Design a protein around this nucleic acid. Structure first.
Length: 117
RNA sequence: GGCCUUGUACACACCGCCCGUCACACCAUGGGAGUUUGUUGCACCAGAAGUAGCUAGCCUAACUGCAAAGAGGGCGGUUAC
């Protein structure tokens, strides 16, 4: 809430209200709307959350995965309608907010320990 | 020119035979800056399915228990090859 109240009201008018709770280090699945022609479908994007930005309607989060041997990252915008659904598969236990050190690790070295209840 | 003996790689029989360099043509081959294929010895990295061990996170028909539960099992995690 570092913006003017009018901007805050205009932004708050468009907030999603069913977002789950997740943190860096968690592995998540994102259902992404894909529209070609008149054809609509949901594509799954599963991976580790390596960064989270809490900025109200300007919130974002970065998901990293290994796809066919090639690392790929996507920075989703949390309140965008293209993000249909987010599910948390497993909760991770980490020591810092940003996990960029994972980019230089491969295989067993990049494993994230599960957070035990 | 004629007889005996002797040496000979000559027998078209010394107007014999025959060797090497240089020139011409053809063939196979050695060396050679490098270019390239296969295979292999060490050292390290990564590492599937599978097998062996550990683990106590989650889920659970046959057995025990009136029931909470227990035993057993499965999924997962983890190490070695």
């Amino acid at each position: 809430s570092g913006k003017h109240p009018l901007v805050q009201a205009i932004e708050n008018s468009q907030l999603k209200t069913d977002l789950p709770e997740f943190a860096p280090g968690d592995t998540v699945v994102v259902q992404v709307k894909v529209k070609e022609g008149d054809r609509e479908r949901l594509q799954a994007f599963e991976g580790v959350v390596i960064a989270k930005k809490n900025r109200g309607l300007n919130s974002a989060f970065t998901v990293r995965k290994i796809s066919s041997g090639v690392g790929v990252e996507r920075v989703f915008q949390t309140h965008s309608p293209v993000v249909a659904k987010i599910e948390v598969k497993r909760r991770g236990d980490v020591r810092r907010a940003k996990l960029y050190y994972l980019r230089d690790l491969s295989g067993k070295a990049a494993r994230i320990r599960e957070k035990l209840p």
